[PDB]
């Protein structure tokens, strides 16, 4: 009933920049919450960022401040993650998830996308 489509990943030298786009389709919305999680091979999922449909009490992990920026476009039903100052550990598998972040209740991550990989390396992928 729903689909999330990821794109925009690849490989770049340290200190470069990128932008990963995740498109959403199949929600009645109301309280959409689109976020990016990071999967480091040999570990589990980690929070990267999250944003609502205009709510804008955004989240960013402790070690991820400043470098990353989150943007949204409800007209296109898309969300984007601007990547700056790629320090090597940022080489990982980025996944966009969608759910609902209610003030009163909490959050659920209902659906996950196909995902894309990012490589902070001196010689590319």
């Amino acid at each position: 009933q729903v689909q999330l489509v990821e794109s925009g990943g690849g490989s770049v030298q340290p200190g470069g920049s990128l932008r990963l786009s995740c498109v959403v389709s199949g929600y009645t919305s109301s309280s959409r919450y689109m976020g990016w999680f990071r999967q480091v091979p040999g570990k589990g999922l980690e929070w990267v960022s999250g944003i609502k449909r205009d709510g804008t009490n955004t989240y960013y992990a402790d070690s991820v401040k400043g470098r990353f920026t989150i943007s949204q476009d409800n007209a296109k039903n898309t969300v984007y993650l601007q990547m700056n100052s790629l320090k090597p550990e940022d080489t990982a598998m980025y996944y966009c998830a969608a759910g609902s972040w209610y003030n009163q209740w909490g959050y659920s991550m209902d659906y996950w996308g196909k995902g894309t990989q990012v490589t902070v390396s001196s010689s590319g992928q």
Partner: protein, 50 residues
């Protein structure tokens, strides 16, 4: 101390259904039960009423 768990960002889902999480620290419960199991992500939706 439920607040430590809520304010950890180590959980993909944290959704309460008759009590707001922020208030759990101020309440006293009669019987509390923890049900543990493994599912897949596309199925974590189904763990909710209705």
């Amino acid at each position: 101390d439920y607040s430590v768990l809520y304010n950890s960002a180590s959980f993909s889902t944290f959704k309460c259904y008759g009590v707001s999480p922020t208030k759990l620290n101020d309440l006293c419960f009669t019987n509390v039960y923890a049900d543990s199991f493994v599912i897949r992500g596309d199925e974590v939706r189904q763990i909710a009423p209705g």
